[PDB]
Design a binder for this molecule. Structure first.
Ligand SMILES: Nc1ncnc2c1ncn2[C@@H]1O[C@H](COP(=O)(O)OP(=O)(O)O)[C@@H](O)[C@H]1O
Ligand SMILES: Nc1ccc(Oc2c(Cl)cccc2Cl)nc1
Ligand SMILES: [Mg+2]
Ligand SMILES: [Mg+2]
Length: 265
């Protein structure tokens, strides 16, 4: 069906490990979208073909206002192309770099939108496993959309692929290579809530080896300006034992969230 000839390519939107993402326009309809380009030789070398297939299959069948759409894919003997919904306001990562920290109202609102999206995912027993600011995109009204389903799966699970980059958002059961489930995304939700209010993630460190130590021991502390409501929520999410982490309805109904979020559930 689709081929490269059907599109006019424009400015680079971002880079990922394999991904190289461009603004693009389809010729007949003038429809604006994003084209995520992957090199076959790099996919083969890294052995991550199965991850790419999962990304396409999982993300294409989901339909939620806070989840980025994937429309289709094609390929041409050097490259694979994913056709994505274009997010015009960029990444949460970029916004955090601009502002250093978010206020309580911005944070609670982002957390509500995240929890909504994740509730829809978990209702299909889909877990994302790579929630972090570079994978959260902003639509035209400034609303948050989860993206980058390359690491997503169905639960329960072990891990089959090597851990590539940052440990900063992963829970203990994941970094210790044990069995995991839905609750991994709740831990990441706690890391995010902290990073939004403080400007850095709670277990950050100079080396892999010590970051590992701080995560498995759950060693984090709060600066003075973090209020009591935020501390209560974050402390509940960042529990070593997964089963003690709250349900998503409990997050969406937490008093600090309901007091500060400017969106409903
Ligand atoms: N649909 C999109 N709209 C706008 N920018 C995007 C879009 N998709 C990706 N980007 C930009 O490109 C980056 C990498 O895309 P991503 O799908 O996360 O690739 P990877 O799997 O390599 O991490 C994102 O962090 C973002 O900066
Ligand atoms: N269903 C599906 C979705 C994506 C996909 O990517 C490719 C392609 Cl086109 C070629 C080689 C390897 C991979 Cl992983 N192949 C099938
Ligand atoms: Mg990414
Ligand atoms: Mg990826």
């Amino acid at each position: 069906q689709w081929a490269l000839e059907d599109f006019e390519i424009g400015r680079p939107l971002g880079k990922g490990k394999f991904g190289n993402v461009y603004l693009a326009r389809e010729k007949q309809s003038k429809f604006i979208l994003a084209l995520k380009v992957l090199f076959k030789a790099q996919l083969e070398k890294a052995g991550v073909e199965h991850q790419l297939r999962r990304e396409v299959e999982i993300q294409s069948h989901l339909r939620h206002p806070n989840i980025l759409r994937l429309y289709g894919y094609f390929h041409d003997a050097t490259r694979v192309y994913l056709i994505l919904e274009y997010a015009p306001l960029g990444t949460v990562y970029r916004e955090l770099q601009k502002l250093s920290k978010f206020d309580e109202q911005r944070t609670a609102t982002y957390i509500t939108e995240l929890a909504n999206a994740l509730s829809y995912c978990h209702s299909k027993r889909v877990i994302h496993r790579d929630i972090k600011p570079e994978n959260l995109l902003l639509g035209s009204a400034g609303e948050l959309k989860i993206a980058d389903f390359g690491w997503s799966v169905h639960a329960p699970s072990s891990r089959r692929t090597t851990l590539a980059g940052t440990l900063d958002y992963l829970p203990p059961e994941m970094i210790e290579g044990r069995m995991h489930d839905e609750k991994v995304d709740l831990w990441s939700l706690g890391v995010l809530c902290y990073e939004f209010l403080v400007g850095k993630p709670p277990f950050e460190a100079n080396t892999y080896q010590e970051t590992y130590k701080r995560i498995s021991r759950v060693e984090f502390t709060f600066p003075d300006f973090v209020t009591e409501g935020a501390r209560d929520l974050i402390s509940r999410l960042l529990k070593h034992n997964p089963s003690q982490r709250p349900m998503l309805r409990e997050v969406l109904e937490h008093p600090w969230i309901t007091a500060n979020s400017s969106k409903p559930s």
